[PDB]
Symmetry: C3
Subunit: 150 residues, 3 copies
């Protein structure tokens, strides 16, 4: 196995429960969603940061193990135009579990974003034999959220 | 055949005519879209309700016949955050054609939603040999909107 | 080869750089994105106009050579509800490179749209053996943006 650690704290929610078609319908990948309860978006895997949305609310990352994931803060967050998010990492940077990628203002975003539901999805499902989704409360950079068999 | 009855009244529009890429480009499935003219979103098939958006503007349903459909009210409706929609059914509930799923305020939604165009799409196209799209005016729980050959 | 000419001026940006999941993640097709610098959206290929968004901010077109492309102005442009866009062409019309499809108000759209990033994507990738993406500054109806091998 490969294990995916929480990129942010909160409660695990099912992907299907996110009020967005692209995510609920697994169009991008399968995974879990987290209802945030904190203030930083950390690396869930050991690897290399891929992309960082100019609005700083989403990023990708490819693990050393060949796992490609995408983390997206909230639904329609692009509206905020960047407000509420501070980018700590750089596209390309090599990181380790627990490493800070983005810092965010939870109370602001919470009052001005359609949703704070954060999808954590596996972009390369086809490389994926088994996907196990855990549940419950998770804490940033520690608690495992998903387990995959390559 | 399997036949899909109108989940809401109005005029049938083509999927391709919905000003949303995910829908117009058939990324989720193929189907028709309806320009609503009434106030309730009903079950189009006999079956089991799957998912209900927390914003109450969209739902899924799997027919007994193995047809999986998704009905989404308007474009970007998640903005409304629930305003305008009353949920009559429960995730999991077993329903029959004509059974009420959601009640909505047509004049409010009409004045505050990007679009009221309602996509009715077949999520499991791959199980689908033939899809026939009807046209014209449809009336809630009565008029057939699509016909499929499994 | 088949070559795709700029449907609008500006700077070529990578698809992956567009702050929208559907586009960044290549869910609709692959291509480039342009940061506009002008005022008209022109035909990139010789062919037949397919679809025009009712909000006039996006269109499709199928080249005589079998290339199917989709051009979408900005991110979430459907909000504007049409403001800022003037439609010069008709669904179905046969056009030639450089032919005007839509006229747009750059300074207005620029102040009221989430983004002006314009994705130019190839919808029928599967028909595509090679896709080459050029870079730099492009000028409406002249500069080639992509080159494909069918």
């Amino acid at each position: 196995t490969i294990e995916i650690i929480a990129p942010l704290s909160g409660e695990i929610v099912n992907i299907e429960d996110v009020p967005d078609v692209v995510f609920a319908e697994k169009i991008v990948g399968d995974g879990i969603a987290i209802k945030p309860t904190g203030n930083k978006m950390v690396a869930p895997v050991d690897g290399t940061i891929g992309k960082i949305f100019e609005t700083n609310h989403a990023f990708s990352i490819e693990s050393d193990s060949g796992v490609e994931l995408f983390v997206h803060f909230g639904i329609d967050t692009v509206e905020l135009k960047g407000e509420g998010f501070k980018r700590i990492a750089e596209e390309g940077q090599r990181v380790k579990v627990g490493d800070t990628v983005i810092e965010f203002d939870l109370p602001l975003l919470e009052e001005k974003a359609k949703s704070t539901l954060t999808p954590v999805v596996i972009s390369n499902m086809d490389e994926i034999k088994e996907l196990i989704k855990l549940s419950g409360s998770v804490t940033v950079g520690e608690t495992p959220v998903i387990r995959i068999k390559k």
